[PDB]
Design a protein around this ligand. Sequence first.
Ligand code: AGS
Ligand code: AGS
Ligand code: AGS
Lengths: 66, 689, 132
Amino acid sequence: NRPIGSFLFLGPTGVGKTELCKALANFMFDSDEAMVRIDMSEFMEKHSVSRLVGAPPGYVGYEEGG
Amino acid sequence: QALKKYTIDLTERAEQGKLDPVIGRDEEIRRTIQVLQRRTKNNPVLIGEPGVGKTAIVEGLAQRIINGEVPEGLKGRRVLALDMGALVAGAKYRGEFEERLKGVLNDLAKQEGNVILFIDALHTMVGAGKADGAMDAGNMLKPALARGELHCVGATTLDEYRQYIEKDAALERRFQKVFVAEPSVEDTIAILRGLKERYELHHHVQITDPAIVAAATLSHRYIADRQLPDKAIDLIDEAASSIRMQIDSPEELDRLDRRIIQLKLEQQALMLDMLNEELSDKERQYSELEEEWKAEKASLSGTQTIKAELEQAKIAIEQARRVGDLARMSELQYGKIPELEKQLEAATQLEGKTMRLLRNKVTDAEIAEVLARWTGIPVSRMMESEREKLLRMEQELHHRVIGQNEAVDAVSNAIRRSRAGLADPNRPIGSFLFLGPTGVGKTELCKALANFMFDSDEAMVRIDMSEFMEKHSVSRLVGAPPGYVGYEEGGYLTEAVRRRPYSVILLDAVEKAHPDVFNILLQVLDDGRLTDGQGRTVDFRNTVVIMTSNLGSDLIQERFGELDYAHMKELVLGVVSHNFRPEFINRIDEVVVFHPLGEQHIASIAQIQLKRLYKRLEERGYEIHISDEALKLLSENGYDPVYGARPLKRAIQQQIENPLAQQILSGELVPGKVIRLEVNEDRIVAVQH
Amino acid sequence: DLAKQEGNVILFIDALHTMVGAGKADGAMDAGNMLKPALARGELHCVGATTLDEYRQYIEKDAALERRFQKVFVAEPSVEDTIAILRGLKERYELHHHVQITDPAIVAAATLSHRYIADRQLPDKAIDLIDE
Ligand SMILES: Nc1ncnc2c1ncn2[C@@H]1O[C@H](COP(=O)(O)OP(=O)(O)OP(O)(O)=S)[C@@H](O)[C@H]1O
Ligand SMILES: Nc1ncnc2c1ncn2[C@@H]1O[C@H](COP(=O)(O)OP(=O)(O)OP(O)(O)=S)[C@@H](O)[C@H]1O
Ligand SMILES: Nc1ncnc2c1ncn2[C@@H]1O[C@H](COP(=O)(O)OP(=O)(O)OP(O)(O)=S)[C@@H](O)[C@H]1O
């Protein structure tokens, strides 16, 4: 009823958060960025949830999901 | 019957040697042979993003059926290719299409499971014929596909699959998916070796194998729009076309032929002579070069034909492996292969001797050239004009940026590291932070880079980071998210980069934005991907990112005297650490520190501005010389620390241009006559002598 | 018919974004889907010519018929090449409009067209100044 894991990595910069996750994708899929990498520094406004969910019916990018 | 008309065989075209070889792809051909041999739903659809080898897997299934490497259930299965454009094109009357398609289904029922039907573009089939009185062509294959009586094989894209088939679930579950993924780099090299054989046979070259491994790795690095293994085949075949075109015509022939026709026109106009003798010498020279060129053409033709006959021998020995002739095997092998290979290498060393008037084999220099002309990025290995240009970097930036040793050294280093091939290929080239007080050369250092690099000042993606005082910023450079207003148009930074992938990104006056606009740039300067609102990421691993703040104007103008450069860099880095966040100044390549100007710098700036002023008036049709004492007054009247170099600009502007504009519109100073700007008591006079 | 010509015909489809959604009737074969298995086998030698924003709108919407084609980026020419183009078309327009054009008129048209008109792009606005 859940995903496999859901980790909240913390810690000051340049100690290997993002390369740990790229290390996981390099292990698991034999490729560094073969993974769904969402930048959570684009979503600084409330109306940009809909980049990942998609568009509600009768709007612009309704044909194209999230 | 109907299968004569509306279908094309593929096992003929794998039997006659018209299809390209298919190398790799173990798991997908085994899974396609699993899904074709069921009782219900004999319908694999091959789904992958376009060009990763989907139609090539049906090519590989045709070739494995003909060679007989398959399990015994498929041995004898014809692979008929259907094309919808041959079905529809006659059906003018009502029900002609339904008659044709029912005829195809009955002539496949009369085969008893023998024919694997190949629809390419399965996404097209849904709704082919929908009209007033119609059957939509999905409502005539839903019964026949439902019972497994048809062995259809689908070949569609992924986004065409979201658009066209999963809008229609009743024909979505008739088909089983086979997810064809993007192939890896090493398998790409394997595919390129098989097609190295094929493309050397077509375009009359020799493709060396380091060109292939460079083409795979460099295509995977630079071209980020398309998908492998197709971008590598693009670089290979376009390099082969380049080599064949350079074989087809030299350039010394151009120079000598234009020379002899020019001297022929001159000699016939003069009819002292000497030009009969010179023209006869040039005609003998041109005939020598023409005969040597024809010798090279004949040698390369013989070598390519003998390579083609070698591959004819390989085709014949595989025909003998399928048929089983006895003396033909050892005959073809031990006769044909080693003697034609050793005389092929004799022709190879002969061409290595005789090709003078050159490049005759597709090697990695040509892959570098085709990939530099594809994208925009300076991939290629340098020429000597560009390399001596590229070591006069600090020279050719002090033609426009006098002053400022430090940052011209730093940015010279960054562009040199990108050109040698030592940059981190996961980050952009230069992610700089020009600091320093008001008007000391920053925006002109960046314009100096654009005039150096692109030979234009107005070719630099210049975000203006003082319009960005609210988070409307973010929404105006990464585009409008779906549902919202400008989703059809996209951002400015992402589109204006993805046009020219190698471009200076100048973020002018970067502290004037809201402090959380430095969070798009976390993504940029960390990895060089920037996902805009239409959804697709944009490769910023080829830019030069320059942000020109002035956060430390008080500190730098206070303390640039009596301190070295290192302590000043550390101290203004402390000030910047108070203004930015620690997540972001970590990302920067090198924070430089500019400095206030001294008087000799101001005098040199004055000479540069008077160069462009003389350029303006020579475009107008005048000439001006100046006295050195006038330059001394412009130097002494344009010194102040707090404002830098624009006091010189408006002092020049006033104390030269305004009385000169008084006098040019006076009808006084006649053009053509030399203007001297000698001093007055304090002003500058202009005379006519 | 073009396959019968044995590759002796280079096709030329200006406004390729017209071709992409061309004959798209009520769910039938447009021009894109019928040409799409004959482009990437080389049996047709099309040459497109498209505006750039039409490319991003109408061709990169449809990724297959995108990757059959090669982008050949044609940048705006510089001022001096514009001067050369204007010299050849000075010959042509002096044939047409019964008048004579001098070299200062050409270099003035190129410089003032690039510096002042901000909407259209070179070499076109230079030729519009000359023709008008
Ligand atoms: N523990 C580590 N082992 C190896 N490389 C590391 C390590 N930490 C950082 N790096 C290098 O630093 C970069 C990755 O930095 P990150 O730690 O991923 O930055 P971060 O984790 O996102 O923290 P922030 O949010 O960026 S400040 C890559 O260039 C890595 O090579
Ligand atoms: N694994 C492979 N083995 C052999 N050739 C390959 C392979 N992958 C790609 N190719 C070549 O790639 C070219 C076209 O690839 P295709 O599979 O035809 O792309 P595609 O399947 O048509 O994708 P779409 O969606 O139909 S455009 C041909 O020249 C093939 O020879
Ligand atoms: N070393 C230099 N060589 C030539 N011109 C210089 C030099 N230093 C400054 N300048 C002149 O200084 C003028 C103003 O500099 P700009 O770069 O335009 O201002 P800025 O550097 O952006 O600083 P601010 O804070 O943005 S006003 C430019 O027009 C240059 O002509």
